[PDB]
Amino acid sequence: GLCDRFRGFYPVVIDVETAGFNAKTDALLEIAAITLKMDEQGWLMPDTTLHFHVEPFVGANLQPEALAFNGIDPNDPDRGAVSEYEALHEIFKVVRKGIKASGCNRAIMVAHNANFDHSFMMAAAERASLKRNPFHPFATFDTAALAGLALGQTVLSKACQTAGMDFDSTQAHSALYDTERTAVLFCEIVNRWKRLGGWPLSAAEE
Amino acid sequence: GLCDRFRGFYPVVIDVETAGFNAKTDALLEIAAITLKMDEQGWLMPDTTLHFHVEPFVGANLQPEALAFNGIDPNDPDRGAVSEYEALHEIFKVVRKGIKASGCNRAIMVAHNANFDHSFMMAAAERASLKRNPFHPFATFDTAALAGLALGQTVLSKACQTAGMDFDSALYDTERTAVLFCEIVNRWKRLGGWPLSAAEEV
DNA sequence: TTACAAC
DNA sequence: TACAAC
Known about the structure:
alpha/beta; DNA-binding; five-stranded mixed β-sheet; homodimer; Nucleotidyltransferase, domain 5
């Protein structure tokens, strides 16, 4: 089961759009989260997906270079952004639920160059004084590393394509879609490892 | 071979001892580094080992709990401590040479919960005002994640034991971490996961 | 209503 | 340089 595969770690794929590279000073603008589930044969696949647009915390820094990269205007009338507390509380609630339903003991962030997203989410969590944050405070499942191992690629787009996934490099990917692509990649990597007899650790001798 | 494996990424195993968890405020006390190499068969293994004790930077923070944990006395005159500049300069110099020799284009840090060690090396490099840092600025190979995939374990000691390694100091940790990284990569190859075409070849 | 693990 | 986690 899911709770057996990673010693009780409930892997949650996360991706964020921001207005800079500094989690402490730069605005969190967007976040998406995908929970995973494992079927009866032990194959991993995407489960539940949430995504929010987030309002820049008070006094937050907005890098013009970053807004040019993601194309987000924090002042767009039609973006319907919620507070960091609103978004994270809902994400945390879903993840806790997933944790109990599957019999895990905590969540771990799955992300591409994971530290980035982990730093922003933890910084926003801390700002909104969210308690009962279910995520590991420093451990992550970074797909860039995992893809380097499995596919010999560290760049998201190329790793997906090498894995046989559809990835349009010419297109800008918002949190929602970057998260989904990352989640499929992670699943593929884990599943192929199992497919080839890497897991269970007795499979190669069965 | 080596530089074909990760698209020119030159994997270097690093482990640091520190006087706290904050990379910007807490002293770096110790660093070890281990380069890797492949044979003609394509099997990964440790190449060279570097080790330095580091003088706390001027005005650095020293968490008593951290010193209790790693048992380092930053004031012991008989620890062969060197400046952050000296240690990283030499490490960077060996890694640059390794990069050129093997035909890679840059280095990537291999470490357990790598962000910790990465943030401390970057902070020190910045402090020492080091130029020519050969390391990728935000990408790493985290053995905790890799071990999560390969061994279903994330804790270093548990992962090493699960891999069939004996696990009982930066030098020790770095060496264990290096061996663990190699076993993970080599097992992937053993099972025919690499190269990609291997699954459809004789 | 810890400690633990990257210190 | 730009690049890639923005």
